[PDB]
Structures are given as C-alpha cells and as structure tokens.
Curated annotation (Swiss-Prot):
<protein>
    <recommendedName>
        <fullName>Tyrosine-protein kinase JAK1</fullName>
    </recommendedName>
</protein>
<feature type="domain" description="Protein kinase 2">
    <location>
        <begin position="11"/>
        <end position="280"/>
    </location>
</feature>
<comment type="function">
    <text>Tyrosine kinase of the non-receptor type, involved in the IFN-alpha/beta/gamma signal pathway. Kinase partner for the interleukin (IL)-2 receptor as well as interleukin (IL)-10 receptor. Kinase partner for the type I interferon receptor IFNAR2. In response to interferon-binding to IFNAR1-IFNAR2 heterodimer, phosphorylates and activates its binding partner IFNAR2, creating docking sites for STAT proteins. Directly phosphorylates STAT proteins but also activates STAT signaling through the transactivation of other JAK kinases associated with signaling receptors.</text>
</comment>
<feature type="binding site">
    <location>
        <begin position="17"/>
        <end position="25"/>
    </location>
    <ligand>
        <name>ATP</name>
    </ligand>
</feature>
<feature type="modified residue" description="Phosphotyrosine; by autocatalysis">
    <location>
        <position position="161"/>
    </location>
</feature>
<feature type="modified residue" description="Phosphotyrosine; by autocatalysis">
    <location>
        <position position="162"/>
    </location>
</feature>
<feature type="binding site">
    <location>
        <position position="44"/>
    </location>
    <ligand>
        <name>ATP</name>
    </ligand>
</feature>
<comment type="similarity">
    <text>Belongs to the protein kinase superfamily. Tyr protein kinase family. JAK subfamily.</text>
</comment>
<comment type="subunit">
    <text>Interacts with IL31RA. Interacts with IFNGR1. Interacts with JAKMIP1. Interacts with SHB. Interacts (via N-terminus) with IL2RB and IL10RA (via its cytoplasmic domain). Interacts with FER.</text>
</comment>
<feature type="active site" description="Proton acceptor">
    <location>
        <position position="130"/>
    </location>
</feature>
C-alpha cells in the first residue's frame, strides 16, 4: 500500500475551504475505518482541464519548503490533489479576524517567509503567475505557507520566461506590465505580485482597500474592457498603489522597489529578504 494513495469512497466532505481558477478546495476527513476519526485533509478537485491539475500535482509533490503547503498525495480514476489542512485558513480571512493579535513585525516575518517559499520555487525554475494574499495559508501565528500552485508553470530552456497562452482569469491588478502588454511571464513578474500581496498584508486584507479597489479609484469602475489598457498607462506614468495606513516609509520603499517597470531591472527575492531582515534584527 502507498501512504500518498487516497480512495474516493473514504474521502467524505466536511466544508468548502477555498475557490480557485479551475479547481475547488474542500476540507475532507479521510476515514478508511469509517467512524469520524480519520485525518482532516484539504482536497482539490476540478469543477465539472485534467492535464493542468496533473501538472500542478507533479510540481507540488516535489516542493519541500517550510513556507510551501505539504502535498499529502493523490486520488485517481480523472484525478484529485490531496494537500495538508491548515485550520487558521488563508491570510484573506485570518488577517481581518486577528488584527489585534498580528502587528508590524509579524507582518514583515510573513513577507520574509512568502519571499523564501517564492525563491525556492524560482531557484527550481518555476513561475507562480498567481501570487496574492488569498493564496497564502496560515500555519500558526508565526508561520505562513504558499497554499496554491494552480497557475505555476515551468520556464522554457534558455528562455527567461514562460509565454502565456490562455489568460481569461489572470488577476490583472496583481500583474506586472510585461504580462499586461507582452503576455510573457518572468520570475521578476512574481516579484511585482509579491509587492501587491505585501500591500494586502499591511492592510490586513481589507475589501474596501483591496488592490483592485484602490487601482479603480485611479481609473474608474465603468470601463469593462478598457480597465486593463488604462492600468498599463497609469504604471507607464509612474503611479503605484498608495501607502497602507500605519506602514513605515522604509517598508513602503521595499514595496515600491517591487514595482521597477522592467523585468531585467527588477529586484529578486533574495534581495527583498535581506532588505526585510534589515528591519527585523
Ligand atoms: N491557499 C490557497 C488557495 C486559494 C484557492 C484554493 C486554495 N485554498 C485553500 N483554502 C483554504 C482556506 C481556508 N480558509 N480560506 C481558504 N485552506 C486550504 C487551501 C489549500 C490547501 N490547504 C488548506 O488548508
């Protein structure tokens, strides 16, 4: 028997955890005995694009980092991704809920961890393409893990990037301009997305000040298919998201430097870590 092999029959649902682009993540108790005593596991199954889920599973299965969600196994017939369950959930609902419990140092410790898990993925020649606060799970009050790899893709040989084919559900307000204009994803673009995730982190994931809403204040919520085009210009001009309320300038300058318009010019994760550690120590 394989410990990473999970039966569909023994996988009884409990509650829906999170919604993804193509996949659906629900909490299941895997109980082979059948008496509410099996371990609780997070289960990703496509809504009724198997190749992509299959590809995500081989990427996650070979990721071993303390700030990357642990792969628990699979479920075949047709496939389901079996991950570990983190009861505190994602930063999206934990941050507003525990504002009092989490302060600035804890917020920057989270950023270092996200940066770290990010570097591991990058050094293993993989590009995330979906780095936002809803994709970061809380291990404990001291530890956070990257919990979704739905749009993670391999970077082509001798190429500095992955050329994006389909992009119908690309999170545009989190995206770098090279992705908005050229539609080619670079590791440097995952750094742009980090800076935005960083803003959400500092605002405790607040709806009324989410990166979409704040960018709309600068372009307008009545332009539908022009939304993206205007956004590209606002960035060409030099404008960026505002400073979060009660965020220091030295932090905001690390956030601003996450938005250096060129990919060849833009910072790496290793630089951001050292930059963050310089504020914690
Ligand atoms: N991270 C992440 C992504 C977001 C899209 C699907 C996946 N979601 C998930 N969402 C949640 C969750 C808990 N509260 N709110 C969400 N928990 C988990 C996962 C994925 C894996 N393990 C979890 O414990």
């Amino acid at each position: 028997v394989d410990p990473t092999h999970f039966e569909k029959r023994f996988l009884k649902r409990i509650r829906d955890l999170g919604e993804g682009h193509f996949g659906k993540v629900e909490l299941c108790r895997y109980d082979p005995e059948g008496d509410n005593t099996g371990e609780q596991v997070a289960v990703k199954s496509l809504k009724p694009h198997i190749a992509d889920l299959k590809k995500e599973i081989e990427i996650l299965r070979n990721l071993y980092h303390e700030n990357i969600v642990k792969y628990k196994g699979i479920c075949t017939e047709g496939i389901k991704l079996i991950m570990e369950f983190l009861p505190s959930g994602s930063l999206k609902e934990y941050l507003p809920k525990n504002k009092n419990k989490i302060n600035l140092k804890q917020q920057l410790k989270y950023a270092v961890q996200i940066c770290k898990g990010m570097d591991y993925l990058g050094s293993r020649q993989y590009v995330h393409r979906d780095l936002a606060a809803r994709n970061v799970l809380v291990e404990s009050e001291h530890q956070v893990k990257i919990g979704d790899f739905g749009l993670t893709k391999a970077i082509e040989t001798d190429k500095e990037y992955y050329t994006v084919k389909d992009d119908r559900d690309s999170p545009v307000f989190w995206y770098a301009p090279e992705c908005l204009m050229q539609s080619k994803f670079y590791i440097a673009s995952d750094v742009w997305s980090f800076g935005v995730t960083l803003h959400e982190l500092l605002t405790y994931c607040d709806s009324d000040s989410s990166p979409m809403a704040l960018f709309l204040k600068m372009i307008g919520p009545t332009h539908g298919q022009m939304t993206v085009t205007r956004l590209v210009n606002t960035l060409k001009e030099g404008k960026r998201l505002p400073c979060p309320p009660n965020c220091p300038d030295e932090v905001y300058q690390l956030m601003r430097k996450c938005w250096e318009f060129q990919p060849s010019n833009r910072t790496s994760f290793q630089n951001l870590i050292e930059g963050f550690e310089a504020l914690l120590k």
